[PDB]
């Protein structure tokens, strides 16, 4: 039912309006119970997230507590590590750009609060290189914090030691991937690894490591402060907590609001943000989780709401919860076509199914926009799509297939007409 | 992806980190874990790019040298990332975001305007070497869709003439107020701040017991 209270809202500094710097952060009281929390114990911190039942705030959804629990196993003589990926290459994820730029500190204490939960020696934050200015803001914030002694050895007047670092991204969406963020951190080409050696087991520099969406690291200190329950209540069943929602494209006031999860899709454009540009009936389709997730057409949308369980029922993913909206004024065949162009210019090429498959769909999709291709080719792309979906080394091939599948699933008649249109003029 | 040695772009172009740069280089090295020079190549390659935009084959060889890694190792890193430029870069190097979010909100619109203003095709440097236009992909900051990152200018929410205005500012003078040149602050509902219009609770507000 959304409509979270401002007091409950996590990032009060969202939209700025409060000094992103430490003195603003102190008025925010972000560093209020940090010593106590760490003192309580690592086990106490994970109890808090397990009670919260928080799901991954990045595109993949998994219990946050269980993921952190995995490398809570005893150290084998290799330093455990924390990796925070501030890269958000996915379209519509200006979600993270806020916390980093507007409220850098929340993430800094998120890092050490999270750090003792996994007993990480240190945390590296991979902010996308594109955001150079953004980087300027966080290390100013990180510098403040150590000057204070909030972070560093004996951080926050406690036995525990932590050091936080910022790493430059270099314009790659794939760098975002969990195994590939590591390799970029390692300095090799940004190519994902296979999951069998899991990230905790083989870490960066062969030292156990864990990767979290910046939102996931940022909420952990406030969730421990507010307790898992407070946070647990807002969510729906497995779904829980407020997740920032970004609405971009064909809406009167595109904005990122951290309104509550489980929001009716019709409600968030209508009540907050801006009602769909041109009217709620001028909605050819909604992209709920960003480019990777399949778009849902208008009749399905208001019925469904934004929570991961509800979306998977709907065949779409909450993902980064980036709402991209397409009025009846858009050539979807071309809209999704550029997302496949978005993925041919970006997939690493390490795996055969994504390399040739994504390029193959790009060629077919461009012909589909022209209408040159015949109607039988449309289900051909269906079959090419699932070959890529289950065979890829990483999830990006998973992601490339879904928008193609969505276009065929709900807009098959329109593509046939574009097929028909070209055949008629000869 | 092949460096055919050319008089301009080839090692005859000597490269060496400024005494100041070399300093920076090590700062990078200790940030990374002990005994792991390799992690520092993407940051060290970035400072070679900071030094000079061209970053020729000579510059990458130096990077490998300073970082004591297989030279190819540096060559592979430079080729994989779009951030690094292996060819000369225009002073301004504007990049226009053309992913679906920006296109839906008119990103394409901007392009046509910029091509005419720079009076040049998309993808190459102006004869003046003044600006270089490229159709880059999602640069983040989608809520503000119309967008053009010029060397981190990340101007956003830009109407066509806005850019023209910005380009002129760049063409005569400098620092043209980089950022979203529309009333909204950072990302904010154009209407206002529905999320939080109240004052923020202070330190230790409703902090749970335990």
């Amino acid at each position: 039912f959304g409509s979270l209270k401002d007091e409950d809202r996590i990032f009060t500094n969202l939209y700025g309006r409060h000094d992103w710097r430490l003195k603003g952060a102190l008025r925010r009281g972000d560093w209020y119970k940090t010593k106590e929390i760490l003192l309580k114990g690592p086990d106490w911190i994970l109890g808090e997230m397990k009670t919260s039942g928080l799901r991954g705030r990045g595109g993949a959804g998994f219990p946050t507590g269980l993921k952190w629990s995995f490398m809570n196993k005893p150290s084998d003589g290799r330093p455990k590590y924390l990796v925070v990926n501030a890269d958000e290459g996915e379209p519509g994820t200006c979600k993270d750009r806020e916390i980093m730029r507007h409220d850098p500190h929340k993430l800094v204490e998120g890092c050490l609060v999270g750090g003792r939960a996994m007993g990480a020696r240190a945390a590296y934050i991979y902010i996308r290189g594109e955001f150079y200015n953004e980087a300027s803001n966080l290390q100013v914030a990180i510098r403040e914090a150590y000057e204070a002694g909030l972070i560093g050895k004996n951080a926050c007047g406690s036995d525990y030691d932590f050091d936080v670092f910022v790493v430059r991204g270099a314009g790659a969406y794939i760098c975002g991937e969990e195994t590939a963020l590591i390799e970029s951190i390692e300095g090799k080409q940004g190519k994902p690894r296979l999951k069998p050696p899991f990230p905790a087991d083989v870490g960066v520099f062969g030292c156990p490591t864990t990767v979290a969406n910046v939102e996931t690291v940022a909420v952990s200190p406030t969730i421990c402060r507010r307790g898992g329950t407070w946070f647990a209540g807002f969510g729906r069943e497995r779904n829980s907590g407020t997740k920032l929602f970004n609405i971009s494209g064909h809406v009167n006031h595109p904005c990122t609001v951290e309104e509550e999860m489980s929001v009716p899709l019709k409600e968030l454009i209508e009540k907050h943000a801006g009602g769909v540009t041109g009217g709620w009936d001028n909605l050819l389709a909604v992209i709920p989780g960003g480019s990777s997730t399949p778009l849902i057409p208008k009749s399905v949308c208001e019925t469904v709401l934004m929570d991961f369980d509800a979306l998977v029922q709907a065949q779409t993913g909450l993902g980064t919860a980036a709402v991209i909206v397409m009025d009846r004024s858009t050539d979807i065949v071309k809209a999704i076509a550029r997302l496949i162009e978005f993925y041919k210019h970006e997939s690493c090429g390490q795996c055969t199914p994504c390399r040739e498959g994504v390029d193959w769909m790009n060629k077919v999709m461009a012909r589909f926009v022209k209408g040159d291709a015949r109607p039988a080719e449309i289900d051909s792309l269906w079959e090419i799509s699932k070959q890529i979906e289950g065979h890829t080394i990483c999830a990006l091939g998973d992601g490339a297939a879904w928008p193609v599948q969505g276009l065929i699933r709900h807009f098959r008649p329109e593509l046939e007409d574009r097929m028909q249109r070209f055949a008629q003029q000869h | 992806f092949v460096h055919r040695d050319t008089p301009e772009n080839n090692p005859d172009t000597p490269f060496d980190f400024t005494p100041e740069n070399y300093k920076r280089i090590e700062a990078i090295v200790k940030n990374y874990p002990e005994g792991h020079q390799a992690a520092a190549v993407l940051p060290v390659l970035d400072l070679a790019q900071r030094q000079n935009g061209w970053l020729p084959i000579s510059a990458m060889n130096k990077v490998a040298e300073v970082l004591q890694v297989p030279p190819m190792r540096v060559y592979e890193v430079a080729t994989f990332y779009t951030m690094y430029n292996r060819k000369p870069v225009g002073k301004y190097h504007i990049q226009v975001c053309t992913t679906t979010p920006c296109m839906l909100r008119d990103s394409d619109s901007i392009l046509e305007t910029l091509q005419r203003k720079l009076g040049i095709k998309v993808g190459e440097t102006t004869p003046d070497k003044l600006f270089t236009l490229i159709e880059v992909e999602c640069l983040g900051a989608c809520v503000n869709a119309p967008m053009v990152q010029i060397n981190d200018n990340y101007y956003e929410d830009l109407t066509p003439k806005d850019i023209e205005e910005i380009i002129d500012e760049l063409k005569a003078g400098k620092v043209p107020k980089p950022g979203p040149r529309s009333g909204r602050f950072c990302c904010e509902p154009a209407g206002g701040l529905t999320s939080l219009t109240e004052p923020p609770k202070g330190p230790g507000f409703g902090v749970q017991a335990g």
């Binding site: 980087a135 300027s136 290390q139 670092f165 910022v166 | 920076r24 900071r50």
Partner: peptide
């Protein structure tokens, strides 16, 4: 500044 993030880095390094 082109090098401000990098200058901040050794400020962080000390």
């Amino acid at each position: 500044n082109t090098y401000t993030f990098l200058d901040l880095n050794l400020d962080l390094s000390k």
